[PDB]
Amino acid sequence: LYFQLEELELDEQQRKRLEAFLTQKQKVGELKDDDFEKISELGAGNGGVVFKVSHKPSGLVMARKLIHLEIKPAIRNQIIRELQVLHECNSPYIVGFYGAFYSDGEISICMEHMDGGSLDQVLKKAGRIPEQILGKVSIAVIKGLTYLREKHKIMHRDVKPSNILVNSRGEIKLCDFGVSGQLIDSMGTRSYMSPERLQGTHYSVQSDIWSMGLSLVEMAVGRYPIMAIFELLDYIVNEPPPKLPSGVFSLEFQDFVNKCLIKNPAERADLKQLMVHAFIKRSDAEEVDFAGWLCSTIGLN
Ligand SMILES: Nc1ncnc2c1ncn2[C@@H]1O[C@H](COP(=O)(O)OP(=O)(O)NP(=O)(O)O)[C@@H](O)[C@H]1O
Ligand SMILES: CCN(C)c1cc(-c2ccccc2O)nc2nccn12
Ligand SMILES: [Mg+2]
């Protein structure tokens, strides 16, 4: 394989992992419904269901997300075409992609199976996620958002703990980002939407930063930090943003989440500012055995 990954500025461990995923991916060509065998259900959300599946031709285990869409064949074909851009989204902070296709009313998005599931699943078992672990998660989310914005000119649009995947090798990766404008066009109890997105405002990277800040507070505290639908949304729009409880969390982490949760998107921190924030600089220097913590917390390996 003639790897052209020089632009990523990968460390040796990251380079080995990314080249290994891409090498496995070479066993996978056209994806068809008949070539899969369902192993189990990984989980489900509002828009789709995700199954752990065996791809019979390659022998690979994958996560197959199925989104029910039975629309004009030409517009569903445009969605499938737009999803093919995922073949160009190679980053240590973005879930690996095998392919996307349509079959009998469902769009399938086939991904790298992440054996640690999502941080939403981890949170249910851990209770609360330690601040040092959240430092590593924050680095991964900022780096993933920067990669999608700088290399592909897209915003995530759906940052939340269920869209941050982890594995037994200690990798942290984003999924469910808005790669397809038409899929966004064609498509509850908790909202991670920014106050400006709830009110109307055009999508900005700033809205993803709010979502990340809220997700960090939830994971730090062990509960959604904001109940009726109007009551919850009215709180986000018209009341002060949530804050981390003082004393239990470092001043750096409190300031970092505070900068993400500023109501005015112009005053709210941007990705460049967050990357050099004291919380990120401190967290990047820390030696944290994320893999060991994850495997111990959820009983992996
Ligand atoms: N690649 C993957 N590997 C392992 N688990 C996955 C993978 N992708 C998704 N999951 C799990 O699938 C479950 C359901 O995900 P999903 O259907 O996207 O719901 P959601 O994240 O709550 N909503 P949304 O992303 O907005 O559609 C979650 O519990 C994830 O942990
Ligand atoms: C709002 C979440 N949805 C369902 C969504 C998911 C994905 C997608 C899913 C998994 C991995 C990588 C992805 O990109 N891609 C989208 N493009 C537009 C919407 N998309
Ligand atoms: Mg999801």
Swiss-Prot record:
The UniProt record lists the keyword Phosphoprotein: yes
Tissues showing expression: Widely expressed, with extremely low levels in brain.
Catalytic activity: L-seryl-[protein] + ATP = O-phospho-L-seryl-[protein] + ADP + H(+); L-threonyl-[protein] + ATP = O-phospho-L-threonyl-[protein] + ADP + H(+); L-tyrosyl-[protein] + ATP = O-phospho-L-tyrosyl-[protein] + ADP + H(+)
GO molecular function: ATP binding; MAP kinase kinase activity; MAP-kinase scaffold activity; mitogen-activated protein kinase kinase kinase binding; protein kinase activator activity; protein kinase activity; protein serine kinase activity; protein serine/threonine kinase activator activity
Regulation of protein activity: Ras proteins such as HRAS mediate the activation of RAF proteins such as RAF1 or BRAF which in turn activate extracellular signal-regulated kinases (ERK) through MAPK (mitogen-activated protein kinases) and ERK kinases MAP2K1/MEK1 and MAP2K2/MEK2. MAP2K1/MEK1 binds KSR1 or KSR2 releasing the inhibitory intramolecular interaction between KSR1 or KSR2 protein kinase and N-terminal domains. This allows KSR1 or KSR2 dimerization with BRAF leading to BRAF activation and phosphorylation of MAP2K1.
Modified residues (Phosphoserine): S186
Residues noted as binding K-252a in the record, renumbered to the chain: E112, H113, M114, S162
Localization per Swiss-Prot or TrEMBL: Cytoplasm, Cytoskeleton, Microtubule organizing center, Centrosome; Cytoplasm, Cytoskeleton, Microtubule organizing center, Spindle pole body; Cytoplasm; Nucleus
Residues holding U0126: K65, D176, F177, G178, V179
Signal peptide: none
InterPro entries: Kinase-like_dom_sf, MAP_kinase_kinase, Prot_kinase_dom, Protein_kinase_ATP_BS, Ser/Thr_kinase_AS
Top-level taxon of origin: Eukaryota
Keyword Phosphoprotein: yes
Protein modification: (Microbial infection) Acetylation by Yersinia YopJ prevents phosphorylation and activation, thus blocking the MAPK signaling pathway.
Consequence recorded when altering S186A: Loss of catalytic activity. No effect on BRAF-KSR1 dimerization
Record remark: domains: The proline-rich region localized between residues 270 and 307 is important for binding to RAF1 and activation of MAP2K1/MEK1.
Role played: Dual specificity protein kinase which acts as an essential component of the MAP kinase signal transduction pathway. Binding of extracellular ligands such as growth factors, cytokines and hormones to their cell-surface receptors activates RAS and this initiates RAF1 activation. RAF1 then further activates the dual-specificity protein kinases MAP2K1/MEK1 and MAP2K2/MEK2.
Descriptive protein name: Dual specificity mitogen-activated protein kinase kinase 1
